[PDB]
Amino acid sequence: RYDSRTTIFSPEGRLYQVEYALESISHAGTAIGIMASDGIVLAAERKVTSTLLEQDTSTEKLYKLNDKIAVAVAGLTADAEILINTARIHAQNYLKTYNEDIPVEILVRRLSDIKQGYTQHGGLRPFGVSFIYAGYDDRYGYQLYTSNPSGNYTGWKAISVGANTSAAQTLLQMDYKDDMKVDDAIELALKTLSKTTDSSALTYDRLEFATIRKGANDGEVYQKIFKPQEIKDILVKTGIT
Template identity: 50%
Template sequence: MARRYDSSTTTFSPEGRLHQVEYAIEAINNAGTCVGILAKDGIVMASERRITSGLLAPAKTSEKTYTLCPHASCNVAGLTADANILIEQARLRAGRYHYQYQEPIPVEQLVEYVCNYKQFYTQRGGLRPFGVAFLFAGYDEHHGFQLYQSDPSGNYSGWKATVIGANNQAGKSILKSDYKKKQEGEMDEDKEPEIPDVQEALKLAVKVLNKTMDGTGSAAAEKMELFTMKLDESKKCVHRILTKEEAQEVIDSVEQEAAAAGDS
């Protein structure tokens, strides 16, 4: 039955499904995992680096994390070529908004613009959906740090912590249990657990990637890309991808905590 309806983006099946959009989402579910976590003092995004061949030269720039404007960045899961088109559109929109109004574009407005562009490709004949999902991280003075997720259909939603890409359900189950965990020695049952800071969020992101990555053996900095967004003393956003040495320190710390928990 599906074969009668999956050749066109604009035709609904009798069940009310757009098969082309579902195929695009399936492409993302087979892509490298990306984790986004909203912290007290910033945002953490972590992504899996899939090394397809040892002969490939190392990329000069990140293939997973992109800066859109001074106060917003994104993580990519899916087809990077498709992502490049949407990233250029987002950068163009952010630049035009700043030129017109002399202030940074609100994060949600930037996300909505990209998602409207994606949705157009699910509605017009002769086009196919973009096979890419995004995690958007941003900051504005009214709403603080924000984390959004978008998929090929053009839907977007705000999250405190989420996972896209391969094995995302396993990653989300870890986030549900560990994102707001009571600190040791905290006895007050009525007190709401606090959200983690950036350093704790980095450890949680590594823990999620360890669970979701397909590779065998111990985690290594070459297989992960860790990104943080924080504010400096002048309240300006600082985007930073951790070096391999810094990433390895976080990974080692997670493994030590896991070993200690296993011993106890």
């Protein structure tokens, strides 16, 4: 119809192919980034589990981009793979050239342009992956963004991608407090994943989590991926288990 090429537009004056790719992101699980002035928590959901699934020796919805920017993953992992690798390469290409770590804003911009190119040119598929980017660069402090499949970006103070977006967003903005705390944000995340996800228990092995903090020294940022057994201790504290 007007799915038939990616380089043709519908008489409505939308593009069905892109819209369709946007629906691709609602067959994968929730990912939540909340920015606080005292840190960013990055949270991700594992949409597949089994009792023989090894998932306790692996990170796969948390990928470090350089030493100061990391992303959370929602969507197809095959789609994700190619763009994460490219992003890591460009961000650190900036490091070589300019002898400073890449600003958060430029690297998202670079990557959103490449997405638009796959729709604009050739007969390639658009990519149905929504990444929440969390970084630190001196020129605007903590910085949070997230990217659409279309190939554009918007800033946020909190955002949710993945499945059941509409509900999840509702829940976040009800319970947000403008100053926030890094600890209160983690707690908020878990509260939200618990409700959108049908895994009622919401166990450690179903959660990936990363916190970006400047608490390690000053002027120096430490990105710490939470490891499984640690994820289990903070569910007791919030009472979920």
